[PDB]
Amino acid sequence: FNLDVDSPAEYSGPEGSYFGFAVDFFVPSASSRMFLLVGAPKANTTQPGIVEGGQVLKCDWSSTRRCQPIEFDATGNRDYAKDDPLEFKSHQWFGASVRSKQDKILACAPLYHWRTEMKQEREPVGTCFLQDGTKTVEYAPCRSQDIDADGQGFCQGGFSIDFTKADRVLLGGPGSFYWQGQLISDQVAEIVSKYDPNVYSIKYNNQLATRTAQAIFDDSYLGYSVAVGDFNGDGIDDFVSGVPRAARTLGMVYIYDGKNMSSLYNFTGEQMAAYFGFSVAATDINGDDYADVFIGAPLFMDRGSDGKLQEVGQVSVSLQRASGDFQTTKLNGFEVFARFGSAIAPLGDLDQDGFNDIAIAAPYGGEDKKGIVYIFNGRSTGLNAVPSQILEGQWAARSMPPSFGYSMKGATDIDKNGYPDLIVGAFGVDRAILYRARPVITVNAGLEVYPSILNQDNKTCSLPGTALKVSCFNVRFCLKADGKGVLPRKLNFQVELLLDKLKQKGAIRRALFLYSRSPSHSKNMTISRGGLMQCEELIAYLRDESEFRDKLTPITIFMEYRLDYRTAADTTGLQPILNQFTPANISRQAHILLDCGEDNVCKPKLEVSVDSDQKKIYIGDDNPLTLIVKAQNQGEGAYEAELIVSIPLQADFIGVVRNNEALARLSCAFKTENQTRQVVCDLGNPMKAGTQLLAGLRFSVHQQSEMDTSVKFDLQIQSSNLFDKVSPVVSHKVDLAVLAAVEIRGVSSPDHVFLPIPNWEHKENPETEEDVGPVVQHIYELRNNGPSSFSKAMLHLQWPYKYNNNTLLYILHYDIDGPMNCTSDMEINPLRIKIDIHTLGCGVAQCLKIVCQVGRLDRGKSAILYVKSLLWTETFMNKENQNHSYSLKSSASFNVIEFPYKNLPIEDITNSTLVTTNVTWGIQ
């Protein structure tokens, strides 16, 4: 919120050069000056026979906004033979990626083409150049004896580059190995020391590079974007690269170890063609010292209010934790086709809040495709997802979109104001803009009113112009100003005081200042540092009792401060801005003395009562807990009476009951501060004697861990009176109950089997299902529905194994879905396998019992048992009374034996169900 948008620094390169396609800071160690590095990959060069070779310019921040190109190559290409160009610098896009660490700078030409050394060709291997002050070396890892599309010939290395804290270059390229992509890393000192101008393919020691993979990974575009950060125990930055065409175009982000190229972690997009991994970034946003991952998906499509698909873009935020398991949150774009996740730039800590902040840009968003950049402050909870400021680039469109964004670099203080600044490049207009942060002054103000209770008949101080006695009081207000970074020694505030702000709106003015004779007064103030609060003493009187109708309405003294901005010597001008969330004013109320008794002081008797209403609230559900409160004042009037409802932990406020006539519509607010969450409700200002109120308060209780027994609420009435200003503390609790509705269901497929059975031949020694009979399958489901969950339970199955020594339903194999183990008292498949109505239950037949152990079925989940059996055809017909209706009845019982919540009274859950398979005759 502290970026200054009124007067930034605008740098412009030649048109058509894509000036601003890449930006970074140049902070040399040999100079106290700093510079802006801007890439212009389509710029023309003095290089002989080279058209649009591209270049990188050094822009001076001091004055004149003048930019000068940094000279890397300045030469022609090369020769393999008489007329056989050994390389092609034309349209090589040199400067498409620019990165700088300390005095080292690295620029690359991803479209540089080679021809190699074997056969005539043009292969976009790409190349880079590393220069330190004087010496310039060429760096082209993908230019090697591994050629064509199978090798590194099409790699276009230098597409994305980055530096580590160990001065190791991380360089990716999408085209290696039929566009699988590749990451190549080398020591900076090794690059320069090993450089031989007479050797085109240079072998570097201690090079970390990914190898080719299976062709399934082709066209992944690994190395499209890269970033650095450490995600393991070591201090050495580890490699992070987005690979947008990976995972059947879903998009992925690969993380590799900094020690060796071994893979560490993976991310995957949830939507195809969204280009998940188009841009990546690494910062710690929660200040927990663990770097956290940011992944851009500018083509991602969310769904609007009507549910239609629309492309707003999406950015993935993954917080690294102690164990290493990321906690990932997503945020979406705002304008359609704006491509929100196009560029993700860490800007450091912009506000100096102690937590780093980040910037995300939508280059084709804003007003008529002008571009827009959103910045987001981080905090302890992680990255807070709402723009604290919006950067809207204003530039016309000549040929292509003036992409504002698509190139950003932050986390560097160029003005030396103690605050990091931000560069946003726009290659559509061939321009780059530098925004400067502001000092962020945090002002602490306070207001105290003297004898806040006014006695109408106490006329002590009066000097209103040949004085006559009048009732008086003093207004004292103090002002503290402090900040971080560079900022002037003293600040100038403009304070405005308003008396009885509630009135004066088509109403009588009830209080005036003594000397001013006015309801309002203003004064110019000056503070220097924190804890230096400077106050002023003003005397405001109260008009005569007969001049107005008086009121029970309190007199609200309203202080407002301005802080006109004159600051930041030279450097155009830089206006410090106040804190993000800060009061622009404060109020305090005074009351006229009325009905306080002969003691001339109001001493209320406050008492708060509460009824249980619902006695029980169940564990896993969200419950409509309503508390009826009885607020009584049996004493004298209590000023600024408020009902304080302390809701701990899982409890969150819903609202107040408007539907009930017997209950009050009193306005309540949910307030969290000083590590205390609670509900405040106005009982009246003042709350008059004999006042009794009834109002309900709805909440929703989920849980905190487990086995908390009951939940406790705290109710107290408090007021601003000098004595007896509070009620007692009345706490009310409601017991948590365990209720989990568990049902057991079963089906048989088929429900019936019609005898005789097609193609049935009895075999003396059965071999397959064809030799036994059809397939009867019983499915039993044990499902937990109720809010609570059970930790362990038992399941009993009774199967009609045999009737009179011959098999009824021959069980082959049973499977289990969910958390359940099962055991059969009789061996399944003793013979193995390849692959009126008379009721037959396990009671009247031989029983094959299956006992299963079940555990940990939560609210949603359930447990299943699939029993696949063959009907034994050989048993039927015969002396089995061929024509008779048989129903095969299998029973299943369940019993819940344990619960995860202890110290809570529990009740056993048991129920049974039966599954029948009816075998009958269609012809008699």
Partner 1 sequence: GPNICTTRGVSSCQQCLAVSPMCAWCSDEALPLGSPRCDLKENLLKDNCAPESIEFPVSEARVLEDRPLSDKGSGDSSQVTQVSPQRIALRLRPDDSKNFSIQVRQVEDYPVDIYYLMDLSYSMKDDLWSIQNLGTKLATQMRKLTSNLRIGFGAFVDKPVSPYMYISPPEALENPCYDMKTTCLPMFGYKHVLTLTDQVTRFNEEVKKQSVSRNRDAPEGGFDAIMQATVCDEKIGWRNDASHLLVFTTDAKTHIALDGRLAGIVQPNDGQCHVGSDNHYSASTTMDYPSLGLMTEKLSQKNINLIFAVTENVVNLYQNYSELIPGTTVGVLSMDSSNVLQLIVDAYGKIRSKVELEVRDLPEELSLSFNATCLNNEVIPGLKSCMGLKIGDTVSFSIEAKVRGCPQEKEKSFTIKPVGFKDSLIVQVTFDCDCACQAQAEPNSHRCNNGNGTFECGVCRCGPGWLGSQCECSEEDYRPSQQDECSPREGQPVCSQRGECLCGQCVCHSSDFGKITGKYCECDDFSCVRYKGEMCSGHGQCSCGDCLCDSDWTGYYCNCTTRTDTCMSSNGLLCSGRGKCECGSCVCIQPGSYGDTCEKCPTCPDACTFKKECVECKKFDRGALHDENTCNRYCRDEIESVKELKDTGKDAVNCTYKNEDDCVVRFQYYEDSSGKSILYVVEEPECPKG
Partner 2 sequence: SDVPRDLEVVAATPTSLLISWDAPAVTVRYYRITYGETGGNSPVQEFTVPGSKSTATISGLKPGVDYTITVYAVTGRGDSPASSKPISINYRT
Ligand X SMILES: *[C@@H]1O[C@H](CO)[C@@H](O[C@@H]2O[C@H](CO)[C@@H](O[C@@H]3O[C@H](CO)[C@@H](O)[C@H](O[C@H]4O[C@H](CO)[C@@H](O)[C@H](O)[C@@H]4O)[C@@H]3O)[C@H](O)[C@H]2NC(C)=O)[C@H](O)[C@H]1NC(C)=O
Ligand Y SMILES: *[C@@H]1O[C@H](CO)[C@@H](O[C@@H]2O[C@H](CO)[C@@H](O)[C@H](O)[C@H]2NC(C)=O)[C@H](O)[C@H]1NC(C)=O
Ligand Z SMILES: *[C@@H]1O[C@H](CO)[C@@H](O[C@@H]2O[C@H](CO)[C@@H](O[C@@H]3O[C@H](CO[C@@H]4O[C@H](CO)[C@@H](O[C@H]5O[C@H](CO)[C@@H](O)[C@H](O)[C@@H]5O)[C@H](O)[C@@H]4O)[C@@H](O)[C@H](O[C@H]4O[C@H](CO)[C@@H](O)[C@H](O)[C@@H]4O)[C@@H]3O)[C@H](O)[C@H]2NC(C)=O)[C@H](O)[C@H]1NC(C)=O
Ligand U SMILES: *[C@@H]1O[C@H](CO)[C@@H](O)[C@H](O)[C@H]1NC(C)=O
Residue with the two structure tokens 């499977």: 815
Asked if 178 touches partner 2 (CB under 8 A), the answer is yes
Asked if 821 touches ligand U (CB under 6 A), the answer is yes
- Residue 188's H or E segment, with its range, is helix 188-193
Q: How far is the CB of 597 from Mn ion (least distance, A)?
A: 3
> Where does residue 113 fall: left (phi above 0), alpha (psi -120 to 50 degrees), or beta otherwise?
beta
Asked if 777 touches ligand U (CB under 6 A), the answer is no
Q: How far is the CB of 152 from ligand Z (least distance, A)?
A: 15
Residue 349, annotated as binding a ligand: yes
- Whole-number Å distance between alpha carbons of 243 and 253: 6
Asked if 189 touches partner 2 (CB under 8 A), the answer is no
Strand order in the sheet with 55-60: 22-26, 35-40, 55-60, 67-70
Interacting partner of 178 out of ligand U, ligand X, ligand Z, none (Cβ under 5 to 8 A depending on kind): none
The residues of the shown chain that bind ligand X, judged by CB under 6 A, are 14, 16-17, 42-44, 51-52, 448, 450-451, 458, 460-461, 472-474, 476
- Whole-number Å distance between alpha carbons of 688 and 743: 57
Asked if 518 touches ligand U (CB under 6 A), the answer is no
Strand order in the sheet with 327-332: 279-283, 292-297, 314-319, 327-332
Beta strand pairing status for 208-209 and 225-229?
unpaired
Q: Are 624 and 700 in contact (CB under 8 A)?
A: yes
Region from 254-262, 347-355, 816-824, 828-836 binding ligand U, contact rule CB under 6 A: 816-824
Q: Are 701 and 623 in contact (CB under 8 A)?
A: yes
Site pattern 198..227 for partner 2 (x: CB under 8 A): ----------------xx--x---------
* Beta-ladder partners of 534: 479
Site pattern 380..419 for Mn ion (x: CB under 5 A): ---------------------------------x-x-x-x
Residue 232, annotated as binding a ligand: yes
Residue 105, annotated as binding a ligand: no
Of 546, 679, 690, nearest to 606 by C-alpha is 690
| Nearer CB in complex with ligand X: 478/851 | 478
Alpha-carbon distance values, 740 to 637, 860, 900 (Å): 50, 11, 12
Asked if 794 touches ligand U (CB under 6 A), the answer is no
Q: Are 508 and 549 in contact (CB under 8 A)?
A: yes
Instruction: Pick from 71, 84, 117, 150 the residue near partner 2 by CB under 8 A.
Output: 150
Task: For residue 657, give every residue at least 6 positions away whose Cβ sits within 8 Å of its Cβ, in sequence order, or none.
Answer: 626, 663, 695, 696, 697, 698
Residue 592, annotated as binding a ligand: no
- Tell me the three-class secondary structure of 541-560, residue by residue: EECCHHHCCCCCCCEEEEEE
- Whole-number Å distance between alpha carbons of 197 and 140: 12
Amino acid identity at 220: S
Asked if 349 touches Mn ion (CB under 5 A), the answer is no
Instruction: Number of residues interacting with ligand Y: please give it, by CB under 6 A.
Output: 8
Structure tokens at 873: 């055809």
Interacting partner of 758 out of partner 1, ligand Y, ligand U, none (Cβ under 5 to 8 A depending on kind): partner 1
Collapsing DSSP to helix, strand or coil, 769 comes out as helix
Residue 284, annotated as binding a ligand: yes
Interacting partner of 599 out of ligand Z, Mn ion, partner 2, none (Cβ under 5 to 8 A depending on kind): Mn ion
Residue 419, annotated as binding a ligand: yes
Interacting partner of 217 out of ligand U, ligand Z, ligand Y, none (Cβ under 5 to 8 A depending on kind): ligand Z
- Residue 190's H or E segment, with its range, is helix 188-193
Of 831, 835, 828, nearest to 768 by C-alpha is 835
DSSP 289: S
Asked if 853 touches ligand U (CB under 6 A), the answer is yes
Q: How far is the CB of 794 from ligand U (least distance, A)?
A: 11
Site pattern 226..255 for Mn ion (x: CB under 5 A): ----x-x-x---x-----------------
Interacting partner of 820 out of ligand U, partner 2, partner 1, none (Cβ under 5 to 8 A depending on kind): ligand U
Interacting partner of 266 out of ligand Z, partner 1, ligand U, none (Cβ under 5 to 8 A depending on kind): ligand Z
Residue 236, annotated as binding a ligand: yes
Q: How far is the CB of 559 from ligand U (least distance, A)?
A: 57
Asked if 167 touches Mn ion (CB under 5 A), the answer is no
Structure tokens at 469: 């006695």
Q: How far is the CB of 806 from partner 1 (least distance, A)?
A: 24
Region from 49-57, 153-161, 813-821, 898-906 binding ligand U, contact rule CB under 6 A: 813-821
Task: For residue 506, give every residue at least 6 positions away whose Cβ sits within 8 Å of its Cβ, in sequence order, or none.
Answer: none
Interacting partner of 597 out of Mn ion, partner 1, ligand U, none (Cβ under 5 to 8 A depending on kind): Mn ion
Side-chain half-sphere CA neighbours of 334 within 13 A: 15
b (16+ CB within 10 A) / e for 171-182 = bbbbbbbbbbbb
The residues of the shown chain that bind ligand Z, judged by CB under 6 A, are 213-214, 217, 263, 265-266
Residue 570, annotated as binding a ligand: no
Structure tokens at 741: 């509705």
Asked if 122 touches ligand Y (CB under 6 A), the answer is no
Structure tokens at 270: 């949830």
The full length of the chain comes to: 924
> Where does residue 120 fall: left (phi above 0), alpha (psi -120 to 50 degrees), or beta otherwise?
beta
Interacting partner of 819 out of ligand U, ligand X, partner 2, none (Cβ under 5 to 8 A depending on kind): ligand U
Terminal alpha carbon distance of the chain = 89
| Nearer CB in complex with ligand Z: 213/601 | 213
Residues 244-263 that bind ligand Y (CB under 6 A): 257, 259-260, 262
Instruction: Pick from 87, 162, 311, 421 the residue near Mn ion by CB under 5 A.
Output: 421
Asked if 583 touches ligand Y (CB under 6 A), the answer is yes
- Residue 193's H or E segment, with its range, is helix 188-193
Amino acid identity at 574: L
Interacting partner of 415 out of Mn ion, ligand U, partner 1, none (Cβ under 5 to 8 A depending on kind): Mn ion
Instruction: Number of residues interacting with partner 2: please give it, by CB under 8 A.
Output: 6
Chain residue at closest Cβ approach to Mn ion? 597
Q: Which residues belong to the annotated binding site for Ca(2+)? A: 230, 232, 234, 236, 238, 284, 286, 288, 290, 292, 349, 351, 353, 355, 357, 413, 415, 417, 419, 421
Q: Point out which residues bind ligand Y (CB under 6 A).
A: 257, 259-260, 262, 583-585, 911
Q: Which residues belong to the annotated binding site? A: 230, 232, 234, 236, 238, 284, 286, 288, 290, 292, 349, 351, 353, 355, 357, 413, 415, 417, 419, 421
Q: Point out which residues bind partner 2 (CB under 8 A).
A: 149-150, 178, 214-215, 218
